[PDB]
């Protein structure tokens, strides 16, 4: 090994439905093969209708967005209004291609409710990319999380089951990915503004999930 | 008349009218003493407000742990010259793991305030400090004034009416010079000389100000109830 | 980025009851090339601090010139300059460590490993260390190059903690350093016999000692060995 | 660089380059802004000592910062240029970065911030520029109307004149002009507007210019011909 | 002519006191300070009556627990409530807290004397700005174009402060409860106003710990001018 | 510190004139009489060596200056500025032209070159106006023979024949009478001896005259052979001998 | 080439209580396989209630402690002699190292000290300033032998109640002062038993709202 | 300091007037007479040389008319010195537009950006106005044949005949009375001429106090033309005139 380890971090998902967006992370830090943390906040909370997801650099990602939720704050004094998710995006993206070739490593998912826009999900990484889609899994364990949630994705899921599937996405992604695990942080984004769905512990998750679902068959029981 | 557009401009008897306009800035200023003994350096600073309903315009300013000073004149010009104290007693700390002694201070202050005599555009401090000290050769205390010139005294006053402090101190020299190792008698002493510069007004919980610097005492300033004691 | 040219090796030092010893060779090697052999290593500043050199003469000649101007520079506008503001050792050290850590951090580093030795106004003992990148380090036994590997060791049987510090007298504490010298002549390929020796103490003052060389030698039993193994004759 | 302090305070505590660049504005041909119930019109004074103009080729008076927001003037014309190009910037830049364009509040916040910047910067003098900036907000039916001046203050208004003679033009439109009942369609606020530089101008022949602006981009300017006809029609109820 | 930072024979900078005679004739605005709140008032004073009031903005919000009322030539605070704003952002950003109001205050001012031959003369506007934090509680700080800022229990400024300011002195007590304070800045504003007093000619504000700096609407000011004359009309 | 004067120390008066490009013509009429005749196959411009003291060395100061081997200039006003605009006018000629196009500037870019440098010193922060009128005579391929004036404005006029300076006013009107379009180069250096008695009071010799011609190329003068397309200079400073040769046959 | 890092070794450990918290760290300075110091102390206190340590590195663990602690000084100088709480100088830390992202400081940061509430609080931050509350953080060379004992220890994972078949699990408790001293010298005796680069002496550093307390312990010197 | 001496070119008088931009229009009007006159099929540019001298070359002479591009040409009225400045200046801002966009430069383009870098003068720097007013003669696809004009505020106007200079008063009317928009291009030469023959304060107009040029299309099939007369061309245009 040469040069320093530093903390790259956990993997996301966020995915547009009927009763608005679904935002689903976990919570493990790794530096290598060492896992440097399993409570990681993955989630910042920008403002009441906005949210942002990190994953590949930890650094890069908290001080950026917390950066961002500074430049969203300036925006709704100015201008007395909130901001755009298109617009929260745009300032991250315009940033980060500033920055594109010193090294920056960022994948984030700018996730929000406005009026005009109505629920919007931008896809923000650090080589520049901008893009609005319904459904993004991001980080390095995204593979895995792409591979549940799109085989039982429908636009007419419930508030309910669509909580459940985006927590079992990350389950799915923590159980595979060496470098996904601790913990599944939940939100669900309306109308109204984001709301916190709790910190769900794989180690209690996994098996309340294996028992009640009869899935994890590979595992020992 | 003609020779005080600028700084830059001498008078024909010799004169920068601008840095005397400046000094005049000063004597409108609220009334501050200083004096010190060889253990303790004190200040102690009437403030000044403009109304019953305003607050007392802060006169006290820390520089570092064991230095600071007392400001009469423009206040933001003394903001800008204690935050300079505060970088170059900071730079002595960091580089040097020194103590800025407070000579150097205010052979700092004055190359400083002088720069702004000489040039054109630009114009001189409006404030005049005090600053007390103490450092490795003991208590010190100076006097600033914005044409350049700092002096180093026993004691001394700067503002409205510091005459009457300042004659006090010369009589009581011999007296408070030997207060040593008792910071309220040094204090005690030193609002017994402002005493001398009031007229019609007399010392209040919210109107005195006090700030003392020691043997074993940092650098700490007195205000509100904790000043009630020597009233 | 540098690459040094002409070097030198160890400095040495230690804490005694009422100061310091330390001590470097006299040589500047030019590779393999003992080149220079007149070539001093310790400089004082003032009369309490000593600042003991290896690496980079270049950079050392350098390091010089900034001393000599820091005691100019407190001379200025400074009436106790000579008394109560006269420059301390641990003044002269963090100057150094300064401008060291600062240069490696402009990628343009002082190719050195300092030791600043001396005795503070109140009577305490100084000696710290600080090198090419910033890193800074205190001991009652410091030494750069070999001497860290051979003469610390020689050096912790005498002053092994703090509390062995006034257990510890002028004369023991010198002759560990002159011993360690020794060591070092027969060890180390970049060193030479003639070096130079300084006493910073609290009562006595600065004693300087130049021109001294190892001696006492063990070599008598070189004669005695033949081959590299099998060979009798 | 040219340094010196142009725009400084009085005695009396006035700025009097900032004073006499609204003399310049008083010097200048005079312009109307009335908005009604679903639109803003913006009116202008042509004067008519010049004679062998070509008016296919001639800078009008009424400019196009975007597609939905437009901006007339009264005062220095070369001055007005560089202030109707930073506009033009700004309206474009804030549609790279925001994904929207610019709000009618928003264009005037930065137009008058240009204003306001020339009157406290060293070595230049104060814009001899007062601006009716009109408009309609992105997805928005409101009809919007604000006036900047030299000083750099700006604010909305329900109909507003500025240039010369233009406290006889707003004269008439303090009683003409009810809060209550805007005019409801496009063409009793061209006529408003129309009847009101009537107070000042001279002939309604090619002295007026007319430009009507609604909701979503959709701007257009008068002719001759159009204008001449609510001029006749004016002229033949006044005769009363 | 003459230089821009030059002193009188006096002692005092001519742009500086020619700055604060431009301030004397712009609109007042009142501040009044309680246990419960700060209060702040302006007088919004439209030019021509086809001036649509509600776009004069003379009370500005810097941050959630900061807001500012200003007076004078009031294109030239702009830029300082732009730079309040940053300045307070900017804090929260570098220490995760909200930014104390002395030290908002301090940091306006700053710019204050930043003009020379830097812009090139001193701001000819006045600033009434106040808040709350943890530290010193509900406070109205007074910030000038000298560089000075005073901490006041109240504080009238514009072109009727003088008379103002003599009525705040006999009414301010430190039991003032909120409710209070807002009648207070409305009877002292039509007292000083020129033109009738209404609730579109002029404007109340406030700020609480609990929900932080608040403009008030037409509506619920228009309730408490009604209520104000009411009060005066029963003895 | 530092040069303060950003802004313009010439500007425009109430009646419209430019007051510091005046008061340098007026500097210029206080001058020297030196003066320009353009003839068929060549030109020659001339002027007074006015001397400050007899003991001063009068070959030492050049009135007369060559520019480039095809070009050369002469003045009336200040000689200072007239110095210091030749040393401008010299490297202005390779750095915006020779050092591009491997030639020499044809003679009226030149004229043109230090008419910028000259106008830029009406409007420029800080400087006043050049005390000096220029009178440039040239030769270029394209173009044949010229002769140009520059004034302190900026502003430069080809000439037939003129004379600018202290008794220009007469000198013209002189050689209004003597010029013809079939004029010889000889002819017209004959004309400008006589043009320059008129100005000149005391001493008439070829030490206190001061003349140049352009006219044919001159290989003896270029310091090298073997290149047939590189056949000398045009310009050529008439010696004190070439001069009094000229004024027997007078 | 001229190489600006370099690896000065030794490792700490932050264990949070609930009126308290302590910072730990050996006091053992090396390079390559030499011992530079014995007593070089790493673990500094900062005023306002803040102990803080910056391993790996020492030139790059200095100049932080040092530019943090001049941090604190101006934040007094510009906010009124305001306290600088814990989460405040941690976001503060996270600036300062960030600003050298792009040429970074080698250390792993830990702070420690009371929140606002008056409970323990212990920051931890990667080299370029992502920073992050626990209850428990070891960090430096011996970091990987450490923090999985204090997983167990202070966290109580993997750690069930006895005879509930694995299904209910040890309750979390705080730990009190003297008994997170007792797993801090454990937790230090048995990483210098397995880490060459830890050793000589032990210093910690406890934090309560009475103020900072030390205490020293001695370590194996092999 | 400096501030002493410095005449603060750039700022308003008590009636909102710039005394410098005043003053140097002042200026402009001693200067030589310049007429634009636009036809339907072609620009004629007419321009009265200062008081000429009869030792002064003529033809190789250019103090009125410059050629900008191909399709644009400028009558100057005011300092000469003054207007190669700008011409310099437009001469590299055409190039500059055709190096961009593989097409000849908008008239009005170029023109806005000379007026654009007379306003700053006028607004900022501290320097002195350019003492120059400019009549732009040009042609492009989309508006075709333009005359414009430009003064020392960097205010240009739009015109279909317009003189600058001296008497422009007088030339104005003249202008005004005989012009007509059905002309053609050898009806407003001749116009340009009288105009000038009348206006001008010399004794009697001749071919040696004169500049000429025309933009016609009189190129063979769709493509413009720029002719700077020659002395004997103009010589011969004012005899077929009877002016001579
Ligand atoms: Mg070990």
Request: charged letters at 25%; proline letters at 3%.
């Amino acid at each position: 090994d040469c040069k320093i380890k530093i903390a790259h971090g956990t993997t996301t998902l966020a995915f547009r439905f009927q009763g608005g967006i679904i935002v689903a992370v976990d919570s493990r830090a790794t530096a290598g093969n060492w896992v440097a943390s399993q409570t990681v906040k993955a989630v910042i909370e920008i403002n009441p209708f906005l949210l942002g997801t990190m994953a590949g650099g930890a650094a890069d990602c908290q001080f950026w967005e917390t950066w961002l939720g500074s430049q969203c704050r300036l925006h709704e004094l100015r201008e007395k209004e909130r901001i755009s998710v298109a617009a929260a995006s745009k300032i991250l993206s315009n940033l980060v291609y500033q920055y594109k070739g010193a090294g920056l490593s960022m994948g984030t998912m700018i996730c929000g409710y406005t009026r005009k826009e109505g629920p919007t999900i931008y896809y923000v990484d650090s080589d520049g990319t901008r893009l609005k889609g319904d459904i993004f899994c991001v980080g390095s364990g995204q593979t895995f999380a792409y591979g549940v949630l799109d085989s039982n994705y429908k636009w007419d899921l419930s508030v309910e089951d669509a909580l459940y599937l985006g927590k079992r996405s990350i389950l799915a992604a923590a159980h595979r990915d060496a470098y996904s695990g601790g913990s599944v942080n939940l939100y669900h984004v309306t109308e109204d503004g984001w709301i916190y769905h709790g910190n769900h512990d794989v180690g209690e998750l996994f098996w309340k999930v294996k028992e009640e679902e009869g899935s994890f068959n590979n595992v020992i029981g | 008349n003609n020779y005080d557009g600028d700084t830059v401009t001498f008078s024909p008897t010799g004169r920068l009218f601008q840095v005397e306009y400046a000094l005049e800035a000063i004597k409108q200023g609220s009334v501050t003493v200083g004096l010190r003994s060889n253990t303790h350096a004190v200040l102690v600073a009437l403030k000044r407000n403009a109304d019953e309903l305003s607050s007392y315009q802060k006169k006290i300013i820390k520089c570092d742990e064991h230095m600071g000073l007392s400001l009469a004149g423009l206040a933001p010009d003394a903001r800008v010259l204690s935050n300079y104290l505060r970088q170059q007693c900071n730079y002595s700390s960091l580089v040097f793991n020194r103590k800025l002694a407070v000579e150097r201070a205010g052979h700092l202050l004055c190359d400083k305030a002088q720069k702004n005599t000489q040039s054109y555009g630009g114009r001189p401090y409006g404030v005049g400090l005090l600053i007390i000290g103490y450092d490795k050769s003991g208590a010190h205390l100076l006097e600033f004034q914005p044409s350049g010139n700092v002096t180093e005294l026993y004691g001394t006053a700067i503002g409205a009416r510091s005459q009457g402090a300042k004659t006090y101190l010369e009589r009581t020299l011999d007296t408070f010079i030997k207060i040593d190792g008792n910071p309220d008698e040094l204090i005690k002493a030193g609002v017994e000389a402002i005493s001398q510069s009031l007229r019609d007004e007399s010392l209040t919980v919210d109107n005195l100000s006090i700030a003392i610097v020691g043997k074993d005492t940092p650098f700490t300033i007195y205000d509100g109830e904790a000043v009630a004691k020597y009233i | 980025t540098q690459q040094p040219i002409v070097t030198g090796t160890s400095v040495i030092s230690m804490k005694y009851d009422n100061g310091v010893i330390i001590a470097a060779d006299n040589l500047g090697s030019y590779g393999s090339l003992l080149r220079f052999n007149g070539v001093e290593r310790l400089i004082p500043v003032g009369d309490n601090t000593v600042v003991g050199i290896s690496g980079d003469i270049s950079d050392m000649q350098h390091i010089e010139r900034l001393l000599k101007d820091l005691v100019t520079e407190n001379a200025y506008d400074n009436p106790l300059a000579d008394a109560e503001e006269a420059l301390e050792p641990s003044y002269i050290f963090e100057y150094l460590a300064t401008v060291m850590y600062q240069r490696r951090s402009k990628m343009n580093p002082l190719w050195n490993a300092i030791i600043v030795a001396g005795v503070q106004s109140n009577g305490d003992q100084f000696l710290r260390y600080v090198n090419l990148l910033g890193v800074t380090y205190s001991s009652p036994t410091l030494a750069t190059g070999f001497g860290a590997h051979m003469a610390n060791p020689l050096l912790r049987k005498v002053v092994d903690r703090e509390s062995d510090i006034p257990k510890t007298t002028v004369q023991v504490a010198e002759e560990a350093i002159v011993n360690a010298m020794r060591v070092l002549y027969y060890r180390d390929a970049r060193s030479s016999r003639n070096f130079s020796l300084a006493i910073i103490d609290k009562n006595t003052g600065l004693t300087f000692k130049k021109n001294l060389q190892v001696e006492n030698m063990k070599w008598d039993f070189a004669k005695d060995i033949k081959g590299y193994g099998t060979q009798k004759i | 660089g040219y340094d010196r302090a142009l725009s400084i305070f009085s005695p009396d505590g006035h700025i009097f380059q900032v004073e006499y660049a609204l003399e310049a504005v008083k010097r200048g041909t005079c312009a109307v802004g009335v908005k009604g119930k679903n639109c803003v019109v913006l009116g202008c004074e042509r004067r008519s000592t010049l004679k062998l103009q070509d008016t296919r080729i001639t800078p009008s008076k009424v400019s196009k910062i975007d597609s939905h927001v437009v901006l007339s003037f009264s005062g220095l014309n070369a001055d007005s240029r560089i202030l109707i190009e930073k506009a033009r910037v700004e309206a474009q830049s804030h549609r790279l970065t925001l994904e929207d364009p610019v709000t009618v509040e928003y264009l005037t916040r930065y137009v008058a911030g240009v204003q306001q910047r020339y009157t406290q910067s060293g070595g230049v003098r104060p814009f001899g520029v007062s601006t009716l900036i009109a408009g309609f907000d992105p997805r928005d039916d409101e009809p919007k109307l604000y006036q900047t001046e030299p000083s750099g203050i700006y604010s909305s208004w329900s109909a507003q004149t500025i240039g010369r003679n233009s406290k006889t033009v707003r004269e008439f439109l303090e009683k003409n002009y009810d809060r209550k009942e805007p005019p409801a369609t496009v063409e009793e606020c061209v006529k408003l507007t129309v009847r009101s530089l009537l107070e000042v101008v001279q002939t309604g022949a090619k002295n007026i210019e007319i430009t009507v602006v609604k909701p979503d981009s959709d701007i257009v300017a008068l002719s001759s011909e159009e204008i001449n006809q609510y001029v006749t029609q004016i002229e033949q109820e006044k005769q009363e | 002519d003459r230089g821009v930072s030059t002193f009188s024979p006096e002692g005092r900078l001519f742009q500086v006191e020619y700055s604060l005679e431009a301030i004397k004739l712009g609109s007042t605005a009142i501040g009044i300070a309680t246990k419960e709140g700060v209060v702040l008032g302006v007088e919004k004073r439209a030019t021509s009556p086809l001036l649509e009031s509600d776009s004069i903005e003379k009370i500005v919000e810097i941050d959630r627990h900061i807001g500012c009322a200003m007076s004078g030539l009031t294109a030239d605070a702009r830029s300082m409530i732009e730079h309040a704003r940053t300045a307070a952002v900017t804090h929260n950003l570098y220490y995760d807290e909200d930014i104390n109001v002395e030290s908002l205050t301090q940091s306006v001012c700053d710019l204050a004397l930043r003009f020379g031959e830097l812009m090139s003369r001193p701001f000819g506007v006045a600033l009434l700005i106040a808040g709350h934090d943890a530290d010193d509680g509900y406070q109205l700080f007074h910030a000038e174009p000298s560089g000075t800022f005073y901490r006041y229990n109240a504080k009238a400024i514009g072109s009727g402060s003088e008379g103002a300011q003599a009525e705040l002195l006999n009414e301010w007590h430190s039991s003032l409860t909120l409710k209070e304070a807002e009648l207070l800045v409305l009877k002292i504003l039509k007292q000083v106003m020129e033109e009738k007093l209404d609730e579109n000619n002029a404007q109340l504000s406030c700020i609480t710990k609990q929900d932080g700096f608040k403009i008030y609407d037409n509506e619920k000011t228009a309730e408490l001018i009604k209520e104000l004359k009411e009060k005066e009309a029963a003895e | 510190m530092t040069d303060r004067y950003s802004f313009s120390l010439t500007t425009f008066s109430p009646s419209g004139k430019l007051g510091q490009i005046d008061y340098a013509l007026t500097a210029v009429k206080q001058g020297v009489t030196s003066l320009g005749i353009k003839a068929t196959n060549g030109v020659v411009i001339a002027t007074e060596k006015k001397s400050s003291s007899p003991l001063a060395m009068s070959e030492t100061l050049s009135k007369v200056s060559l520019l480039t081997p095809d070009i050369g200039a002469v003045y009336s006003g200040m000689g200072p500025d007239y110095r210091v605009l030749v040393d401008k006018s010299r490297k202005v000629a390779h750095t915006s032209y020779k050092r591009i196009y491997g030639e020499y500037p044809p003679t009226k870019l030149l004229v043109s070159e230090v008419a910028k440098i000259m106008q830029e010193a009406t409007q420029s922060g800080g400087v006043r106006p050049f005390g000096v009128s220029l009178l440039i005579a040239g030769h270029d391929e394209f173009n044949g023979f010229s002769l140009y004036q520059v004034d302190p404005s900026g502003s430069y006029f080809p000439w037939k024949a003129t004379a600018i300076g202290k008794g220009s006013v007469a000198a013209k009107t002189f050689l209004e009478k003597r010029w013809n379009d079939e004029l010889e180069l000889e002819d017209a250096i004959h004309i400008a001896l006589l043009t320059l008695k008129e100005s000149v009071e005391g001493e008439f010799n070829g030490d206190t005259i001061e003349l140049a011609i352009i006219g044919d190329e001159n290989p003896d003068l270029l310091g090298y052979t073997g290149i047939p397309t590189d056949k000398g200079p045009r310009f050529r400073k008439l010696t004190s001998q070439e001069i009094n040769d000229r004024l027997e046959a007078l | 080439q001229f190489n600006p890092y370099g690896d000065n070794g030794g490792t700490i450990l932050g264990i949070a209580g609930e009126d308290f918290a302590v910072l730990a760290g050996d006091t053992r300075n090396i390079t390559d396989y030499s011992i530079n110091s014995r007593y070089e102390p790493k673990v500094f206190d900062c005023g306002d209630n803040i102990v803080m340590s910056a391993n790996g590195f020492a030139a790059d663990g200095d100049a932080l402690v040092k530019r943090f602690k001049n941090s604190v000084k101006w934040y007094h100088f510009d906010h009124n002699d305001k306290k600088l709480s814990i989460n405040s100088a941690a976001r503060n830390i996270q600036h300062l190292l960030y600003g050298k992202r792009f040429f970074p400081y080698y250390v792993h940061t830990i702070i420690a000290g009371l929140d606002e509430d008056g409970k323990g609080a212990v920051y931890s931050f990667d080299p370029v300033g992502s920073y992050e509350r626990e209850q428990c953080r070891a960090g430096g060379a011996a970091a990987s032998l450490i923090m999985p004992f204090l997983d167990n220890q202070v966290n109580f994972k993997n750690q069930y109640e006895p005879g509930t078949n694995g299904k209910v699990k040890k309750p979390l408790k705080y730990l009190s002062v003297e008994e997170v001293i007792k797993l801090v010298r454990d937790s230090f005796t048995s990483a210098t038993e397995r880490h060459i680069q830890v050793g000589d002496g032990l210093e910690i550093l406890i934090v309560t709202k009475d103020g900072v307390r030390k205490e020293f312990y001695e370590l194996k010197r092999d | 300091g400096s501030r002493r001496y410095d005449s603060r070119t750039t700022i308003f008088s008590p009636e909102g007037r710039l005394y410098q931009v005043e003053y140097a229009l002042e200026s402009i009007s001693h200067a030589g007479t310049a007429i634009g006159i636009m036809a339907s099929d072609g620009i004629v540019l007419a321009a009265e040389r200062k008081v000429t001298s009869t030792l002064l070359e003529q033809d190789t002479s250019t103090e009125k008319l410059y050629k900008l591009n191909d399709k644009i040409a400028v009558a100057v009225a005011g300092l000469t010195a003054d207007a190669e400045i700008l011409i310099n200046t437009a001469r590299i801002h055409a190039q500059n537009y055709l190096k961009t966009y593989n097409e000849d430069i908008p008239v009005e383009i170029l023109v806005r950006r000379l007026s654009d870098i007379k306003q700053g003068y006028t607004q900022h720097g501290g320097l002195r106005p350019f003492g120059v007013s400019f009549i732009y003669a040009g042609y492009d696809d989309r508006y075709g044949y333009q005359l414009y004009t430009s003064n020392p505020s960097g205010n240009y106007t739009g015109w279909k005949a317009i003189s600058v200079g001296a008497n422009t008063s007088a030339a104005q009317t003249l202008l005004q009375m005989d012009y007509k928009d059905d002309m053609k291009v050898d009806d407003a030469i001749e116009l340009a001429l009288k105009t000038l023959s009348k206006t001008t304060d010399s004794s009697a107009l001749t071919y040696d106090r004169l500049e000429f040029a025309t933009i016609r299309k009189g190129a063979n099939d769709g493509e413009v033309y720029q002719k700077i007369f020659k002395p004997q061309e103009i010589k011969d245009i004012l005899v077929k005139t009877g002016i001579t």
